Structure formats: structure tokens, C-alpha cells
Design a protein around this ligand. Sequence first.
Ligand SMILES: Nc1ncnc2c1ncn2[C@@H]1O[C@H](COP(=O)(O)OP(=O)(O)O)[C@@H](O)[C@H]1O
Lengths: 646, 231
Amino acid sequence: LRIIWGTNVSIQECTTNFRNFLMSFKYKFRKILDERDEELYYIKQLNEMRELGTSNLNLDARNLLAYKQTEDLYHQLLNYPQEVISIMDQTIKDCMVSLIVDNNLDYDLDEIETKFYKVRPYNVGSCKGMRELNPNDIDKLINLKGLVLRSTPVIPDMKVAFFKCNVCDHTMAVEIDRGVIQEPARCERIDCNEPNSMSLIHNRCSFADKQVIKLQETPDFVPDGQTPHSISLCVYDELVDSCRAGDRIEVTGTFRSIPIRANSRQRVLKSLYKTYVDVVHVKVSDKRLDVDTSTIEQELMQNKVDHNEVEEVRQITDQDLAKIREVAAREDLYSLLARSIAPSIYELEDVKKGILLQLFGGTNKTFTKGGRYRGDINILLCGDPSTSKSQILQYVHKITPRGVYTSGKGSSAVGLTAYITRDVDTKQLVLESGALVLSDGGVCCIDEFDKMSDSTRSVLHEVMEQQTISIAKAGIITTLNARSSILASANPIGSRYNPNLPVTENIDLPPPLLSRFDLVYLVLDKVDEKNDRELAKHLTNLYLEDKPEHISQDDVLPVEFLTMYISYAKEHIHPIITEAAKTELVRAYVGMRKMGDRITATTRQLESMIRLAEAHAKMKLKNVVELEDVQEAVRLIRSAIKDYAT
Amino acid sequence: PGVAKSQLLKAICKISPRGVYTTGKGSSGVGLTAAVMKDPVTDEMILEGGALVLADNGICCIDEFDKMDESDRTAIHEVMEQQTISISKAGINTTLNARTSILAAANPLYGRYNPRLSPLDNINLPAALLSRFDILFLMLDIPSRDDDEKLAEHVTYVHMHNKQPDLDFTPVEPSKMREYIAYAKTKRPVMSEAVNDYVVQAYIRLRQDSKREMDSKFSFGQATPRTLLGI
Ligand SMILES: Nc1ncnc2c1ncn2[C@@H]1O[C@H](COP(=O)(O)OP(=O)(O)O)[C@@H](O)[C@H]1O
């Protein structure tokens, strides 16, 4: 039997056995999933590849596990990427040919048979992270996680060369395929002699696209005592401009290792090789955390249509959409959704409710010239410590798609933008994005808001007000936007809050800046006895029977309905706040202005009430607001106002 | 000062493996967080760890907690929430991990122990940091007639010799002790339902009597639920 020299594969068994895979697939992945649509996938997805004209079929790996046979081809694939991927390409093309001979008059048969089809696999295991990898395991497939720092520009690559002479003149050309390009010394015209000069015109030849993206990961189950780490990867043609600066990406690719020169002068290729990744498939969306917006995305909605790519937005299916319109008919949604956010922390349903309303933030209205009104709302919450302020911030840090978590006294005025530095691998001056440009669209978090400087906290007078940032130093003189929803916290002098003391006095802020924040909570403690029984019964309810059961009685909690509920509530709704409520709204604002002769009330309360109000109208799927429900949009400030009497 | 507290810190920061003993000042702010430096022959730009990144899953002894710079205080308060030290300096945006345990040793206000003076008057630390410690101690120093002879025979019995205990006890050698404690950490016990009742009712006791004083007297208010999770 035939074999390849580096491996143990054969072209016949892989080809015919994989052809035998693509004709029968009946949810054996559910037979592992234990069952808790009977037509197979790849006829349907091959038709979706067929009529729409898009290339780039993609399959999983667990699907290759579940079917028996071809339990073998998986272990062939995970070891030997390049050859096996080439084989699956060839049999996909012949499967398209074997489909088209059913009706015989299909799509001008030559070119759609001529066009390159390719395979992108993913989900190929995750056992041990980047650190453990021995040099035994050079060429395999690897999954990673973590974010993305910067993005190099575009650099071409020769795929075709092009030659001329001065005699007299003939114009042969040559390809690459292996590592080097040979050029002839003689001849053309005459061929034979004379051995004329052979020039290279480097404005006529073909090229390619090669982009380098630098990455930093978070490999869970750490090899203690590990510190974070940085890898550099080298994406190719189609996947150029498929990664911004800030996303959370899960990557597949082939680990490689190529030596580097010494000092650009000799041929002394230094030993002790350098490693990188050589990506294949990029996985941006996810099913557990939140989904990105649409008013931000619209430039790359305007792009990416000429050239077929990946989805970037969670695909809303059709069957559960009926369940969305069913759960929307529930009356108790306003306490059910706010009850189902953080099922391990149990108080402060006005605060849970405001954190729910930060996820539904405002209506994005753009004017003709100027304007540019976002849906930003901004929340402080303070009070006594030992009140689980941190649990909320870690949970919101998990849910948010593009969240960045700084702290107090670990900041600087440099430390939030323009880290203009010296990159080592290319040895030039490359500019980095700081801590708010990565926060662009989403939720930031700041702890210990008391203990900033004067220079820091003078950043936020621009971000909170103008919704811009204006860098002006020696690199770049150009303003750049950072829309963000800032959440923060502070601990008083006490640390216990004492009564008969001014509320503005007990937190060391200038009360205009305290007056600039939208929704200010003041969570204090009660000396009474009746709640604490239910408190300890919740804790020992959690510790018992060593299994996550935490809240099942007497409550229904959606696990991941709410993320697609929020995203579907974020695209397909535009709420408008027309005439009939302006009487009550202006009436209550002038009623708020009545107090005069501690904290006061400015126009930020009015801007606050319209944006929080229409944020409540974004919930429960209503394109207009009503005169009713504005009252509790006032009461969200009035609950803190009853918490301001003491 | 003479309750011999530094001996325990050198001791338990010698029994436990991966145990780092840092004095007051001492380390800078950048000494016990990580820093970035260029790496010789293997390349490049690794985050060189500090004191806290060195000793994780261990014990970090600290002397003279009052004399710390205030940036170090916020670093310690970030260690009191789990896993987290966050840096936004000139070349770092990372969130490194630390699973450490902190033992501290703070001195009172000068000179010592005035019962005229209130608690937290003789303490230079806020009660939030007192609430982050689930267990707080105090070692008094009052002259008393009876213990002095036992103490003098104890100490002079070791300058006279090199071993203290007698009648009837031998000290366990520390290697076998580390084998015992190293064996002990593979158990994961499971609670039950009668201890639920007893823990709940005891928490009702402590919560109940702790908040009927409400004063800056020798009482310490207000028995936060961190004591419940700590107990
Ligand atoms: N019960 C005791 N047994 C033995 N030595 C003691 C005892 N109490 C105090 N000492 C002595 O008191 C000294 C205390 O100093 P040390 O523990 O080094 O720092 P600090 O003075 O801050 O506690 C020790 O050197 C020790 O010799």
C-alpha cells in the first residue's frame, strides 16, 4: 500500500472514507449529548453554499468523533493538518461535481466548477494551554483565548515573478511554489546567446496579503505560579481586517517555528528558534456572553459584503423567536429579568434593576449636522463595605462584550491612552491604544473612585461630558471617540455611614462631579433581625450538597435566553417618546427644581430621565413610550431620595 | 512590643513552602507588584514578578503594616478581593493572578494600650480593613506575678541548654509535620443540616447582641457577615 514519507496516511482510504462521511449524518453528536431535522447537514449547507454563491464551508470536529466509522480520520487530522486539509478540499470539489449531474443545466458549469472551495475546521480540543507545549508537538492544531492588542499594516507577498531584458524584448515569468525564486541568466531573443542582462520589473507581478496581529491570552487552569504572556500570529488573505483592537477571540491554527537572522548583515541564522501561530479559523461571536451592537458596526456592515466572511453577529434562529414573543407576554418581566441577573447576591433590586437598565442604554439618534446623541447612562454605587460590591463588578465584567477593568492608584494620565512605545520585533515606533479606547462601546469599571489624583479624574470631565478624547502630543494630533458606560464605586471615610451628617460630606468628591453622575446609590445596613435568617439560609443553601443548584425554588431562571433577548432588544427596536408624556415629564422636572433655599438637581437629571425612560421603553418591545411607566422611571431616583433622609 | 511576634513570622514563614517575608520599607510599590524588563538571551519582554507574584498559594508575612505607602495599601486591598492585581502603567494592561494568604503585624499608636483611649484611637487603620480580616487578635502586656517565674525558668532553661520542652512531650520534627499537613489537604469535607441550624442560630446571637451597643467603646461593631462566611 502507498504511504507518505513523514506520515501514515493514504489518499484512497481518506478520500473514499470521507466521501462516505459526507453522505450520512443523523445527529450522533446528540447521541453523545444524550438527547434531552432528521435530514443531514451537508446537503442543506451545501445548498446554502450553492445558491448564495459564498465559498468557505466549515465543520466541527466532534462531528467527526461521533460518527463511526472515521473515528480514525480525526486523529489523522489533529496531527497532520496540511495534507489532510488538501485532501478534503479535493473531495469537496468532486462532491460538487457529483451533485451537478442531477439536473445538467446549472450555473454555467465551467466557472463554478473552476472556483476554489476550501475547508475551515474548528473546535479541535482544548486540553493544555500555551505554556505546557513541548517541542515534540510542533505541527498540530491549537486553541487559544484572550484579547488582541494592536494590528500591523498590510504587507504583500510575491506569488508570481516577472522578467524582461533589454534585448529585444521577451518577457518570460516564473512562480514560487517552494521557498525560493530562481531566475535565468540567459536567454530570450535570441535564446541562444548573447547572455544579456536580465532585469526584474517589480510593478507588474502578482501579490498577496499578509497581516500580523499581536495577541495576549488568559489560559485558565494556570500552571502556578504563572504570569501573563504574549504570542504573535500572522493571519492571511481573506481574514485580513477580521480583527479589531479589543475583541475576545478563540483561534485555531498551526504552531510553527522558523529561525531568524542575526543583525541583517550576514547569513548567520541564529539557533534557538522563534515560535508563532499560523491561523485558520476565527471564532468572533459567542453564545454565553453578550452580543455586539449595530450602530458601532455600520462601517464594517458597509464593508464585508463584497467579500464573503464570518458572521460577527449571533444568528437568531426562528423557533425560539416564538418563545421570545411568548416570554414578552409575561406580566412580571420587570422583576423576573431583574431577579434573574445575579442569582447569588440578594438585596438591592433597584440596583440590579439599574444594572439591567445599563444594558438597554438609551436611543441612538443622529442629527443632520452635529448632535450625535448616544444612550450612555452612568452609575455610581457606594456605601459601607462588606456589601458585595466586588461580586457585581466581576459578574458585569464577565457579561460585557468589551469590558476593561482598571483600579484606583494604578492609573496615570498616560495610562488611559497613547502608549507610544518601541516594538521589539520590527524595531520602530508603534502606537498602542490605552485603557479607554479598548473600552469603546460597552462597560468600564473603576474601583476606589475616592483615591484618584487631580490629573487622573480630569480625564473623565471629557469622557462624561463631550463624549470625545482629544490626544494632542507628538505622535498624533487627532481627536478620537470612546463611547463607554462608566460604572464605579467608592468607600467612605467612616467606613460606616453615620446619620445626622451630610451625604455630600461623607464621600470626598466635589459635588458638581458627584452631581454629574446619573444614578447614585447609597446602600446602607439595617440593624433589624428578620432579614438575616433568610440571609444565612441562602448561604448555607449554597454551601450544601456540593452542586450548583442555587436558586430553583420558587423561581424560574433563564440561563441564556436573556443574552439573545437583550441583543434582539438592542437591534430591532427604535423607541420614540412623543407628545403625551411631556406634560408629566416637564411637570416633574419643575417639581424637582422647587427644592432650594447637600445635593441639587440640574439638567443632567432631565437628560437622565428621558434616556432612562426610553431605556425602560426599549424593554417589553414597544416602539413608542407611554404616559404610564414614566412614574417608576422617576421612582428609580426617588428610591435613593428616600435613602437620603436618615 | 515584647510579646515575641516576629518569631512566629519567621517561624511560619519557614514551615510553609513558598513563603515570602517582606519588611515594611522595604519593598517599593513596584517591588511587590510585577515590572517589565528586557530579557537576555531568550527573547523577549517578560514580566518579571515581584514579591506577591512569587508567593502565590502560600503565605506572605508582612512586618510593620502601618508604615506602608498608601499605594501598597490599595494593592493589599486588591488582594483581599480574590485573584486580582490590575495595572495600567506605561507598558502594561494586564490582570495577573495571586491566590495568596496574608498575615500582618501592626503596632498600636504610641505608646501602648491606654484603656482611657478607645479602640481604633490606638489603631492607625480603618475599620473596613478590620472587616476584611475575619480574625483579629491583640496581645496585651500587663505585669503579673505568677507567670514571671515560669517565664524566667523557661528562658534561662534555654540559655542553659538548647532544647526547651520536658515532662512529657517531644517536639515533632518539621519535615514529618509538612508530610502530615501536606497529606491533610486532599479531603474536601461536606456539611449537613444540623450544623445549618446551629450556625444560623449562632449568627442570630452575634448579630443580635452586636448591634445593641452602637458605641465607640471597647465593643467592636457591627459583626459583618464576613464573620459568618469566615466562621
Ligand atoms: N514568651 C516568650 N518566650 C520567649 N521569648 C520571648 C517571649 N516574649 C518575649 N520574648 C522576647 O521578646 C522579643 C520580641 O522581639 P521580636 O519578636 O523580635 O519583635 P517584636 O519586639 O516586634 O515582637 C524576642 O526577641 C524574644 O526573645
